[PDB]
Amino acid sequence: AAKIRRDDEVIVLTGKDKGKRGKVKNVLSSGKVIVEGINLVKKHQKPVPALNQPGGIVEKEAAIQVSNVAIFNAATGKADRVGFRFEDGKKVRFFKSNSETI
Amino acid sequence: SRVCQVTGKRPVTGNNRSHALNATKRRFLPNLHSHRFWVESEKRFVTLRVSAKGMRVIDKKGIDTVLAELRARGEKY
Amino acid sequence: MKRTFQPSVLKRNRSHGFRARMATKNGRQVLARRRAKGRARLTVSK
Amino acid sequence: MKAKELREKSVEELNTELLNLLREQFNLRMQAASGQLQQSHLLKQVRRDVARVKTLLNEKAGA
Amino acid sequence: MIREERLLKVLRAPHVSEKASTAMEKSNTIVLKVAKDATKAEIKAAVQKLFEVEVEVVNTLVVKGKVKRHGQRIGRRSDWKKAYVTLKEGQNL
RNA sequence: UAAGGUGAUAUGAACCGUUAUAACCGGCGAUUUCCGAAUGGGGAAACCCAGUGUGUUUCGACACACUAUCAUUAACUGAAUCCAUAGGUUAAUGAGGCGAACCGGGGGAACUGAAACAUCUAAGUACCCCGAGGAAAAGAAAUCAACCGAGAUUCCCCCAGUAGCGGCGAGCGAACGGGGAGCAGCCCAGAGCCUGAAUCAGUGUGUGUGUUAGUGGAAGCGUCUGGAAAGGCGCGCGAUACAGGGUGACAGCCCCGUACACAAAAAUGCACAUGCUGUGAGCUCGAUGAGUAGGGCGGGACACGUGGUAUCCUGUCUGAAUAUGGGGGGACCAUCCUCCAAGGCUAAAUACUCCUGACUGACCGAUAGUGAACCAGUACCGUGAGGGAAAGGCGAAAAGAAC
RNA sequence: AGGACCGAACCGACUAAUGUUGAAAAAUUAGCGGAUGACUUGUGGCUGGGGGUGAAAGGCCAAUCAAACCGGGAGAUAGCU
RNA sequence: CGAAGGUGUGCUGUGAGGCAUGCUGGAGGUAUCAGAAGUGCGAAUGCUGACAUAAGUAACGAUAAAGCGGGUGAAAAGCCCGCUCGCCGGAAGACCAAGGGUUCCUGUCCAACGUUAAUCGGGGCAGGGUGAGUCGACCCCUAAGGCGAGGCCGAAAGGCGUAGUCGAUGGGAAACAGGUUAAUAUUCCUGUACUUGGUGUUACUGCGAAGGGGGGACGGAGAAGGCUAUGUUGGCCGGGCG
RNA sequence: UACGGUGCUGAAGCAACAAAUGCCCUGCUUCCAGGAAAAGCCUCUAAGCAUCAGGUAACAUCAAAUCGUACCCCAAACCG
């Protein structure tokens, strides 16, 4: 299965946002994730003469790699790796280092 | 084709050799003749394309045994 | 001047077409080489 | 809807067959190609639903 | 008779143009894109039974597909069939 | 298996799904237009035209199925002619076509070399054709050997560039014998005794294992440079896991994995076991392959070019003996030794890679490596067979340039 | 009547000039021959490589002909450059 | 805290070479001592790509020929409109077959294509456009010729060929006038027609073939005669009196 | 009158002569070099069917499917 997944809160390990926490917006099958407020790029797009014309410099979030984030433990308050155990026929994720099921 | 229907003699190949030994390709042909054989057990003439030693082997084995061999190997007479 | 290629579709097909390659041993070997070389159009049909 | 179609009779899958083609399929091709039909996914789901009815109808009839 | 399963697959779209428009508003004919293997008896029966009108006669041409290109990649479109369906004096659609 | 999906260029729109009937992966099914062996007739492939039968509560039109040829078998018919054969009709079974190499067989060059060329060579090669299998072929001594013995076939290393063959030129080139790989023997020509006795073949079932989806899978932080850290420095931990790949520079400990341990509802390959069917064990006695062996003539294969040339094959003409017999032992004769032709089957060692998986390289890195890293046998050229390109790399991320 | 006469279409190609990296891998312009015949032309068919066809020139057989084109033997061979 | 590579400088060895370093570059390089070579190019009328040279030179493709006004446009010798002028008129007009295959028509763009410019185009992009009982094909029938069940023949592949079956360039049923679209028309519309089959009713009734006969059924040349298409002139009708 | 045209209305609409290489003519005359086939078409019957089927005539009704149809076509669209 997948370790970092959709509605999950992560911290960022490498680059430009190192140590910034945030919630995963979505997760792309390239092996990337979009996490809110994190990898902000300053796109500037053209006001297309179709449906509504924003123009300007829109500040979006970019997709960071899945390996550049790890999910935030919040019981220790640090980054933590994820394993998979079976509980009652459910393959659950669990935090390593305190072994807690998420 | 030039195949004896009894003995199965194809034409084979060879060489004209000369006095200077010049090899040339040739074909040896069987002595195929179309002869009409009386069968007494059927009271009929079955015509075959035999060699001239298919007639020897028909004279020795008899025509009935030979026709049993041709019917055996699917040669249609 | 009258060049060599004076086109006719009926002679193109009767001569070099598929039903005429398949009609004999050696044209079938032609189609076998064109398929084996792997060729977008085998004969000249249309 | 796969067990639901599986539990009728041959006559009733011929009825919902002819109603998938009749009411749904044709009116959405005519409605789609005349500028209407905002909802385009209906074309897909109707088409696959006719595939289900013909599948169960072939499985029910004989082998 | 023609089965209704065949008879639904024949008509494909109404054809919108200005020749089509003047055919409707001037000579009762509705122009519509049909199945490529659809005969005139099938188109007549399918407009008789799917728009519930009375058809006088059908005229079918087949339109050849245009070789377009994207970038430097050509491709022929696709042949379709167009039926000029002449209705009777009582019609709407 | 699953929290994300509706293949790519290729974004959108419209939606589906989140604890299970989204999607993705696998087993088995269903559908599978038209052309193509193409098979109902035809044809300029992807089209034209049917016949026959069954059914169609608007049966004045539709739908479905069958209809090719040939071989074999059976049934019913059936001439010249009486019986009968030929023929005809119908049914059942099988075949047909494609495919890269390997294999057996039918045909079979020349350039070249001989410092010319004709015998010879190249070479039974290239090529053409037929056929078959996962291998084929061969194979169970009418074989060698040599007065001792060996014991079917096939493959490898010697023998040995040897003996020989050779316009005795150019060249061709063994066997015996030795060492290994592998090892397996049988059946019919024929009756009685006796039966299902080993034997395999076809199938069911059970077990084991493998394939086709998968599951879990260890262990790290601080600080400095930097756009970014996996790098420097400092201190820790894993290892049956430091194979490899990715991650914003070089990561055992970030991610996917690797070692390791497990997993199959279903379909299967292999190996045992077992049920049924077919098949025949074993004993006594008998038989023990005729236009054949051999011969004459012509040709070919044997390393051996007709030579003193054994042996094998046969196009032609002939032609035995048949266990008190016959073949061979390199002209040939005698003595001695060895073997039993004219019927057939047979695993393994062996050869090859269209194709699949894993791994590896003192192989190539875009004028190289495939012709082809890129929608390449394409564009393009040629009536046609056929010929046949060029063309990779922004960035870490499009943040790909609002105004 | 005529392998008759003159002469357009039609078939041809005698002379000259241009052109000769052409407008054209054989033409243009001005004259020229045949023009009811052994003529000319359209569409289809047949003949194939030591082979075809030839009112014969070794001509023609897809701008190729004292032996076509393609592929292969094939990296033929080259005492020569 | 900056590799390979690229481009300079300085030092150094007898030489092939080596070493250090500035700038570009942006991620790899490799001592020493061994090992293996697709191991060193200026020549091969070498192969591939790039770029010069002649040189802003010859040429810009029939010596049928243009001139002006106006419009559009950023720009007009070339486009559109108008008036003149010239050229073809047994063609340089019109309609097809073969062949091509969207080039047709409309809107839009001027990068490349157009031997110049281009607003234009057979160019780019998008949309539209081809309507049949009577035209043609398919279809029925056949020629040359192809293929060919059986068959005869042939090492194999295969050759020939009977029945048959295909094969037009030939034989076989039927529509004309007028109007219309930017683009189709003997196809659409208006008017007036015709042909061949199926089925049903009614009246009369001998029908029936891969069989017999007719017909289809067919040469070159020449000669007139009768016509028509078509044209010329007069009449008529409308307009002009310059 | 989006000046591009769009509708409405519309007179005469005859005769003479000339005349084809087109039509009668697949004729006629003539000449040797002696000039496709098969079907549709019309007829004759054989086997068979014979108060049925079929044939003919009139009327009515249904059907006539499929593919081509743009555009160039002595040429800037075909072969060069």
User: What b-and-e string marks burial along D15-29, b requiring 16 or more CB atoms within 10 Å of the CB?
Assistant: ebbeebbeebbbebb
Closest residue by Cα to the C1' atom of nucleotide F299?
Answer: B14
Report if CB C8 to strand G is under 7 Å.
Answer: yes
Chain D CB contacts of E11 under 8 Å are 26, 30
Beta strands in E1-93, from DSSP E residues, in sequence order: 11-14, 29-34, 55-63, 67-70, 73-76, 80-87
CB contact under 8 A, D30 and E5: no
C-alpha to C-alpha distance for B24 and E67, rounded to whole angstroms: 63
Environment class of A69 (CB within 10 Å of its CB; exposed 0-12, middle 13-18, buried 19+): buried
C1’ F251 / CA A67, Å: 12
Whole-Å CA distances, E14 to A61, D33, E45: 46, 7, 16
A17 CB below 7 A from strand F atoms: yes
Residue A42 in 3-state DSSP?
A: strand
Instruction: Specify whether the CB–CB gap between E11 and E32 falls below 8 A.
Output: yes
Which among E17, E11, E3, E9 is positioned nearest to E85, based on CA atoms?
E11
Does the CB of C5 sit below 7 A from strand I? yes
Nearest residue to A68 (alpha-carbon basis) of A94, A33, A98, A42: A33
Looking at the DSSP bridge assignments, the partners of residue D30 are none
Contact call for D34 and E14, based on CB within 8 A:
yes
Tokens of C33: 């080489």
Contact E13, E33 (CB under 8 A): yes
For chain B, the residue count is 77
Structure tokens at A76: 């220790």
- Mapped onto helix, strand or coil, the DSSP state of residue D21 is helix
Into how many domains does chain A fold? 1
Q: Are B10 and B2 in contact (CB under 8 A)?
A: yes
> What count of CB pairs under 8 Å joins D to E?
23
Q: Is the CB of C39 under 7 A from strand G?
A: no
Cβ <8 Å between E5 and D18:
yes
Residues 21-50 of D with CB under 8 A from E: 21-22, 25-26, 29-30, 33-34
CB contact under 8 A, D33 and E13: yes
Range of the domain at A41: 1-102
Tally: H helices and E strands in chain C: 3, 0
Residue B25 belongs to what domain range? 1-77
Q: Are E32 and E82 in contact (CB under 8 A)?
A: yes
Domains in chain B, number: 1
Structure tokens at E12: 């494909």
- Considering CB atoms only, which of D21, D33, D34 is closest to E8? D21
- D14 contact E CB<8A: no
What resolution in angstrom units was achieved for this structure?
Answer: 4.5
- Report d(CA C37, CA C29) in Å as an integer: 12
